[PDB]
Amino acid sequence: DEVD
Amino acid sequence: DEVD
Amino acid sequence: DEVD
Amino acid sequence: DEVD
Amino acid sequence: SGISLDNSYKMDYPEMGLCIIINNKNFHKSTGMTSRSGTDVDAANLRETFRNLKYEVRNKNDLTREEIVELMRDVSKEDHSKRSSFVCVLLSHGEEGIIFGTNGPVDLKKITNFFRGDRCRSLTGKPKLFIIQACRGTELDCGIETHKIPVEADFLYAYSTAPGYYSWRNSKDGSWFIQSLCAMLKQYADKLEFMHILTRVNRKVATEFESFSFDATFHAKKQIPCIESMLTKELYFYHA
Amino acid sequence: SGISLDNSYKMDYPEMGLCIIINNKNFHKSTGMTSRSGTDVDAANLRETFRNLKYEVRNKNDLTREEIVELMRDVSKEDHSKRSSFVCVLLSHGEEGIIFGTNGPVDLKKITNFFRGDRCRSLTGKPKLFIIQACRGTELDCGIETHKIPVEADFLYAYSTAPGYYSWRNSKDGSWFIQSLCAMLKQYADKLEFMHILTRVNRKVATEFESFSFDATFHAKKQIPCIESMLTKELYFYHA
Amino acid sequence: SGISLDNSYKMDYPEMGLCIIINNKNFHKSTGMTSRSGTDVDAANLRETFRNLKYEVRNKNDLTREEIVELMRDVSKEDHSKRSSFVCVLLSHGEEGIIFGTNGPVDLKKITNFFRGDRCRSLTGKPKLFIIQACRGTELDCGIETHKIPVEADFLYAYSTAPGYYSWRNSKDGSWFIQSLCAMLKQYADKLEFMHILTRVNRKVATEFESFSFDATFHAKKQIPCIESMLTKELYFYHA
Amino acid sequence: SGISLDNSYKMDYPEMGLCIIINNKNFHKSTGMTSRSGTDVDAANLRETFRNLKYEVRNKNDLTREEIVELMRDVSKEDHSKRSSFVCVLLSHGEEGIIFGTNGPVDLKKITNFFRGDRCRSLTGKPKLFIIQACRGTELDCGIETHKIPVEADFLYAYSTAPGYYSWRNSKDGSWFIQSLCAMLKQYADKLEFMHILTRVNRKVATEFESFSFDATFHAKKQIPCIESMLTKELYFYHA
């Protein structure tokens, strides 16, 4: 999971 | 009240 | 097809 | 008519 | 175009259709049938109710058996191409499968056959509604304390009472069934599908009415209407 | 508490209720009635379909007229207090108002009277559904190219065919009506009210089926089911 | 039990919940903010409207920034276990993300944070509705001729106007948004899901209102409300 | 014609409309922005999903700030007379009110202003949907264990996350929001109104997703999408  |  |  |  | 569904009848034709109301109050003495006091209240209530739904209402009073047949025959031969549906209301004495003309009985099947899918092509695939306020027998409900289609398809018979039972009419307020039907139509015609409106009518008649008579045989009796549907789609009186 | 409405039957009782399926295939030779090939497919389809709806299904095969009555009597005497509804499916030969036991006819009214609001108090106010796959006559549809309540209230008769008409059954796929009913229940039981599901069944039977026979009299015939409702509320198989 | 679905919030708790209405009309002279003529009409309309929906209404008038915070803090510390939801209506001057107390501005986030899922456990999983009649900027619309959950979940912000825009209030009839909101609630609270009711409010404000001013800069302006939903289920004010 | 109602957008135009999908994965090194692994899965999922809804899908990859503006400008100048609606999906890095082009930020308002009711007359009165998968800040949700119209009217902003919050994207399965949106559209586009479908998306994202990171700061975080509606009617992707 990563952030935008 | 009456019937038909 | 048949009838009941 | 007026504004808030 | 986007995805389309066909779950309800097309009711956006130029005209909603005809609403034939046959109101038999006075009967030929020789028939030995009493007058139907209060039926005029029913006829006026229905006229106004269907007028509000945009139906072309035609009221007919005291028609003989012969006149009923000829009226139905002629109506079925009209061009209904531009009409969304057809409604016929019968107010009279009757028994199972029979409606009474002023001079004698008429088979309900004879009346409805004129509108069969193969006999009235301009109504094929369109809802044909028969609303019947008349007895279907002499039983009394004592109650209890709480590419081809079938020619018989697209018919809806809204009977005022259960098969084999008497139907009640109040000489002052009109018939229990018609009173309730008009009330529910006025309140939900813009909101609910026809079967759901009729279900509300069933509940109204079943819970809010009970006969009062000095004759123990006819006192404290109840009534439940009977919805007989051969419809193939949902019916909404509104569109768009 | 906030505003409450009571337009639909309470279907959140501990149990959905019983689903009695009477499957008559073999008849006593003396009755002169043929076996109903394909009816087992109907019985299994119904068992699975109602099992998925959480009904307590009881299948009974080849019951005599006497056995049908006693079964119905005993079932009506059970305590249904914790059940939301009652369903009975009849698969057999028949005619108008009659279902056939393996040794003779049985009046439908005799079967349903056991469940009247005043005779089965634990079912009073609860939907009683009778699903009937059987003939209601010999007519063939040629088609056309495109605080008290009534004791008869809360009954729903889902007839496979129109009054006075034959009902069709395929010896391989099962009856047109039952096939369609199960399919529509599987697909919309979680989505639509029962009358709307039945309307979909009407459309399916009316448009997707047509008989094929080497006998011109029975070839290319159609069928339209008949929904006969005395229900007083909307019926949803789901809750919450 | 039969099949169950969980698409809508449970609104059958013993109490619908609290409806806090903060009505700021008079502001401390030093703030240089004008009085909000017509806001009392809004406050009374809202009180009556939510009273009819069975909410425990508490009206507060002319609260300072400090009083608004303490009120919200105290309300969030109450036991809402027996309540279905929470509603807070703010009527005052404002700008983007800000509501004005009588003596100064208050961050909207400060007010709503007290009700976060992790800060008000008795409201966790329950709809928290904030209804805001206040400006969100100075823009004018000229119009055109025609098992864990997020702490921010279950909030619904019904803004009277689009982000960055002025919000209109009539000194005689009350604010466009509140007038419309109450009207739509009175008419559809028993019929439609909350988002659909709010959509009707959007249409009412957008089509039925247009400003009239002798000042060309503020004349003939329009308004569109803004529904900001973080709700996770459908919200119906009725139950059963 | 019978009674008509206008509660939902007309979606039976010859074409559903355009669906512009801007997929920014690779960014100019000088911007110091990382590539968005998994975004291609989102772009393909959206292309297929809207293709099934009968939208004219146009996918664009790695567009600069200048290219995004020119694309939007040109699209807004097309003749949409025969189209029912307009959809634009933005997949990229962002912050509150900002979407990132490959070489720099772009104000969301600049993009949407081209479609204002007074600037795109062929879309006036038609739903304009902007679907945004991008951060709106750096906040993390720790969760908790369970006749004129406004120029801004008819816009719907479906944000992947709450105002001021980060938005989560899985490098393998795609973004939480887009994954859920496509799934809910595939399952309910034929059944539910758009706001109700989006509410289902909110519930899916809120309950089925939680971040996993070796970095305590970013571990076990939640997300709630945000529906921002200025629509004036109900939106159904199907018709008839």
mmCIF file of C-alpha atoms in Angstrom, chain G residues 6-8 109 113 116-118 121 124 136 139 141-154 161-163 165 188 192-193 195-196 198-200 202-203 205-207 209-210 220-234 236, chain H residues 6-8 109 113 116-118 121 124 136 139 141-154 161-163 165 188 192-193 195-196 198-200 202-203 205-207 209-210 220-234 236:
data_model
loop_
_atom_site.group_PDB
_atom_site.id
_atom_site.type_symbol
_atom_site.label_atom_id
_atom_site.label_comp_id
_atom_site.label_asym_id
_atom_site.label_seq_id
_atom_site.Cartn_x
_atom_site.Cartn_y
_atom_site.Cartn_z
ATOM 1 C CA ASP G 6 -27.724 -4.237 5.811
ATOM 2 C CA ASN G 7 -27.916 -1.394 3.294
ATOM 3 C CA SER G 8 -29.458 1.211 5.597
ATOM 4 C CA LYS G 109 -13.237 20.710 11.965
ATOM 5 C CA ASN G 113 -13.869 16.282 15.552
ATOM 6 C CA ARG G 116 -15.286 11.317 15.356
ATOM 7 C CA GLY G 117 -15.833 7.572 15.567
ATOM 8 C CA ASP G 118 -13.021 7.260 18.088
ATOM 9 C CA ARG G 121 -18.135 5.843 20.949
ATOM 10 C CA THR G 124 -19.761 5.211 16.279
ATOM 11 C CA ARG G 136 -18.130 29.391 2.149
ATOM 12 C CA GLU G 139 -17.954 34.024 -5.047
ATOM 13 C CA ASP G 141 -22.983 32.454 -9.240
ATOM 14 C CA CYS G 142 -24.269 34.441 -12.232
ATOM 15 C CA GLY G 143 -26.184 31.413 -13.468
ATOM 16 C CA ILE G 144 -27.165 30.660 -17.055
ATOM 17 C CA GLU G 145 -30.557 30.731 -18.780
ATOM 18 C CA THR G 146 -31.940 27.235 -19.347
ATOM 19 C CA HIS G 147 -12.705 -4.958 12.392
ATOM 20 C CA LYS G 148 -12.294 -1.202 12.123
ATOM 21 C CA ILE G 149 -13.910 1.793 10.470
ATOM 22 C CA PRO G 150 -12.529 5.231 9.538
ATOM 23 C CA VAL G 151 -12.977 7.913 12.220
ATOM 24 C CA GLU G 152 -14.297 10.256 9.513
ATOM 25 C CA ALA G 153 -16.889 7.771 8.301
ATOM 26 C CA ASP G 154 -20.639 8.235 8.847
ATOM 27 C CA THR G 161 -23.866 26.476 -1.005
ATOM 28 C CA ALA G 162 -20.994 25.376 -3.268
ATOM 29 C CA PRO G 163 -17.374 25.561 -1.988
ATOM 30 C CA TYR G 165 -19.495 30.717 -2.672
ATOM 31 C CA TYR G 188 -40.502 13.242 1.544
ATOM 32 C CA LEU G 192 -37.353 8.961 0.129
ATOM 33 C CA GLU G 193 -33.814 8.181 1.295
ATOM 34 C CA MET G 195 -29.570 11.707 -0.269
ATOM 35 C CA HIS G 196 -32.558 11.789 -2.630
ATOM 36 C CA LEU G 198 -31.188 16.496 -0.460
ATOM 37 C CA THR G 199 -31.023 16.194 -4.243
ATOM 38 C CA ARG G 200 -34.577 17.570 -4.340
ATOM 39 C CA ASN G 202 -30.577 21.117 -4.622
ATOM 40 C CA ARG G 203 -33.097 21.317 -7.448
ATOM 41 C CA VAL G 205 -32.724 26.066 -4.527
ATOM 42 C CA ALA G 206 -31.197 25.998 -8.005
ATOM 43 C CA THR G 207 -34.417 26.624 -9.917
ATOM 44 C CA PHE G 209 -34.468 31.214 -6.272
ATOM 45 C CA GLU G 210 -32.664 34.205 -7.764
ATOM 46 C CA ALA G 220 -29.724 38.134 -10.331
ATOM 47 C CA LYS G 221 -27.423 35.627 -8.645
ATOM 48 C CA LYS G 222 -28.071 31.908 -8.188
ATOM 49 C CA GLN G 223 -27.097 29.209 -5.691
ATOM 50 C CA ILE G 224 -26.558 25.465 -5.642
ATOM 51 C CA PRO G 225 -26.236 23.600 -2.323
ATOM 52 C CA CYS G 226 -23.516 21.030 -1.830
ATOM 53 C CA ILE G 227 -24.012 17.550 -0.396
ATOM 54 C CA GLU G 228 -20.797 16.187 1.086
ATOM 55 C CA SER G 229 -21.324 12.579 2.128
ATOM 56 C CA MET G 230 -19.052 10.206 3.961
ATOM 57 C CA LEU G 231 -22.026 8.044 4.933
ATOM 58 C CA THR G 232 -21.688 4.275 4.561
ATOM 59 C CA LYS G 233 -25.371 3.355 4.415
ATOM 60 C CA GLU G 234 -28.731 4.628 3.196
ATOM 61 C CA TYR G 236 -34.306 6.707 6.079
ATOM 62 C CA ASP H 6 -38.990 14.734 -13.659
ATOM 63 C CA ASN H 7 -36.956 13.401 -10.736
ATOM 64 C CA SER H 8 -34.135 11.845 -12.757
ATOM 65 C CA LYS H 109 -11.289 24.375 -10.522
ATOM 66 C CA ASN H 113 -14.694 25.493 -14.998
ATOM 67 C CA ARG H 116 -19.705 25.188 -16.218
ATOM 68 C CA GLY H 117 -23.308 25.530 -17.343
ATOM 69 C CA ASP H 118 -22.504 28.807 -19.068
ATOM 70 C CA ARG H 121 -23.952 24.844 -23.373
ATOM 71 C CA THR H 124 -26.014 22.453 -19.516
ATOM 72 C CA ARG H 136 -6.323 15.752 -0.691
ATOM 73 C CA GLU H 139 -3.722 13.398 7.117
ATOM 74 C CA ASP H 141 -7.108 8.068 9.457
ATOM 75 C CA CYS H 142 -6.188 5.780 12.368
ATOM 76 C CA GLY H 143 -9.701 4.358 12.409
ATOM 77 C CA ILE H 144 -11.497 2.835 15.384
ATOM 78 C CA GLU H 145 -12.421 -0.775 16.159
ATOM 79 C CA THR H 146 -16.122 -1.447 15.607
ATOM 80 C CA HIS H 147 -35.554 30.585 -16.176
ATOM 81 C CA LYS H 148 -31.976 30.099 -15.028
ATOM 82 C CA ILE H 149 -29.808 27.556 -13.254
ATOM 83 C CA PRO H 150 -26.546 27.925 -11.299
ATOM 84 C CA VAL H 151 -23.377 27.475 -13.383
ATOM 85 C CA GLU H 152 -22.051 25.136 -10.674
ATOM 86 C CA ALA H 153 -25.150 22.955 -10.715
ATOM 87 C CA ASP H 154 -25.177 19.395 -12.093
ATOM 88 C CA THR H 161 -10.840 10.262 0.206
ATOM 89 C CA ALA H 162 -12.001 12.766 2.845
ATOM 90 C CA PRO H 163 -10.910 16.443 2.603
ATOM 91 C CA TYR H 165 -6.515 13.150 3.787
ATOM 92 C CA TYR H 188 -25.500 -2.161 -9.235
ATOM 93 C CA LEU H 192 -29.431 1.478 -7.992
ATOM 94 C CA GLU H 193 -29.300 5.267 -8.350
ATOM 95 C CA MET H 195 -25.652 8.212 -5.049
ATOM 96 C CA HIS H 196 -26.663 4.850 -3.568
ATOM 97 C CA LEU H 198 -21.400 5.582 -4.277
ATOM 98 C CA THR H 199 -22.629 5.012 -0.729
ATOM 99 C CA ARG H 200 -21.920 1.304 -1.258
ATOM 100 C CA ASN H 202 -17.962 4.280 0.776
ATOM 101 C CA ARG H 203 -18.904 1.242 2.840
ATOM 102 C CA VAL H 205 -13.570 1.171 1.175
ATOM 103 C CA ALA H 206 -14.278 1.912 4.834
ATOM 104 C CA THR H 207 -14.693 -1.695 5.946
ATOM 105 C CA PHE H 209 -9.394 -1.982 3.457
ATOM 106 C CA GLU H 210 -6.633 -1.230 5.954
ATOM 107 C CA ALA H 220 -3.068 0.173 9.953
ATOM 108 C CA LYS H 221 -4.652 3.268 8.425
ATOM 109 C CA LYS H 222 -8.185 3.560 7.048
ATOM 110 C CA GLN H 223 -9.960 5.602 4.374
ATOM 111 C CA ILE H 224 -13.428 6.945 3.680
ATOM 112 C CA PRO H 225 -14.303 8.356 0.239
ATOM 113 C CA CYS H 226 -16.184 11.614 -0.069
ATOM 114 C CA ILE H 227 -19.214 12.203 -2.280
ATOM 115 C CA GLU H 228 -19.611 15.876 -3.141
ATOM 116 C CA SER H 229 -22.869 16.382 -5.017
ATOM 117 C CA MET H 230 -24.291 19.451 -6.663
ATOM 118 C CA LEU H 231 -26.587 17.294 -8.794
ATOM 119 C CA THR H 232 -30.219 18.361 -9.148
ATOM 120 C CA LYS H 233 -31.731 15.022 -10.146
ATOM 121 C CA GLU H 234 -31.374 11.286 -9.588
ATOM 122 C CA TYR H 236 -29.561 6.124 -13.300
#
